Design a protein around this ligand. Structure first.
Ligand SMILES: O=c1cc[nH]c(=O)[nH]1
Ligand code: SF4
Length: 204
């Protein structure tokens, strides 16, 4: 059942976010600082879902505030999308992490499929609350959360997908993947992210 017993019967995002702070649906609440719920309002037509809060998000209490978020902001601006009009969240609400010796940050670790399924009732509550017209799935974990554990983001770029989810679905690269690598490859990947955001914004 995972998080289900912890989700209150409400669509108020402030009430949902407070309840997520008390969630024990998987083990991730133990070491994380706090739950990081989605940000934005229930009028949003576009919802965007990443993997999990990272190091910066875990302490800010807000999603996509670190380097990946700054790259995402650049892509949203190039796509003529106002971040303030979106509802932005993550498939898992507590940061899963470790530290390396001499390291500069806490390093995120990939949620297991078990943790994703455990936390998914929060995503369902968010989608019920917001009623988005389109959901942008940023990266493998988020895409698989709605499209199945076998789903390959790399094989469905640019496609409007739909499964029977309380919207059109658009699965794209995670912004963190665009931070590193040879410059020409990063630039081609950035253009593809802008394209996918534009596909989402053009739905209906
Ligand atoms: O909110 C965030 C920040 C970094 N990476 C994610 O998937 N989500
Ligand atoms: S990651 Fe999700 S299911 Fe796990 S304890 Fe946190 S809010 Fe609950």
């Amino acid at each position: 059942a995972g998080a289900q017993d912890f989700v209150p019967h409400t669509a108020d995002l402030a009430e949902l976010a407070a309840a997520a702070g008390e969630c024990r649906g998987c083990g991730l609440y133990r070491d994380a600082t706090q739950a990081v719920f989605g940000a934005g309002g229930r009028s949003a037509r576009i919802m965007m879902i990443g993997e999990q809060p990272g190091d910066k998000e875990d302490l800010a209490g807000l999603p996509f505030v670190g380097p990946a978020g700054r790259l995402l902001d650049r892509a949203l601006e190039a796509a003529d999308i106002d971040r303030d009009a979106l509802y932005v969240t993550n498939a898992v609400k507590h940061f899963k992490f470790t530290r390396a010796a001499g390291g500069k940050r806490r390093i995120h670790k990939t949620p297991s499929r078990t943790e994703v399924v455990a936390c998914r009732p929060w995503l369902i509550a968010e989608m019920t609350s917001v009623e988005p017209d389109v959901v942008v799935l940023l990266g493998a974990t988020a895409a698989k959360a709605l499209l199945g554990n076998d789903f390959r983001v790399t094989q469905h770029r640019g496609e409007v997908l739909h499964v029977d989810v309380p919207p059109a679905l658009v699965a794209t690269v995670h912004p963190s993947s665009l931070l590193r690598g040879p410059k020409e490859e990063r630039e081609s990947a950035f253009a593809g992210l802008v394209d996918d955001l534009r596909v989402a914004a053009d739905v209906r």
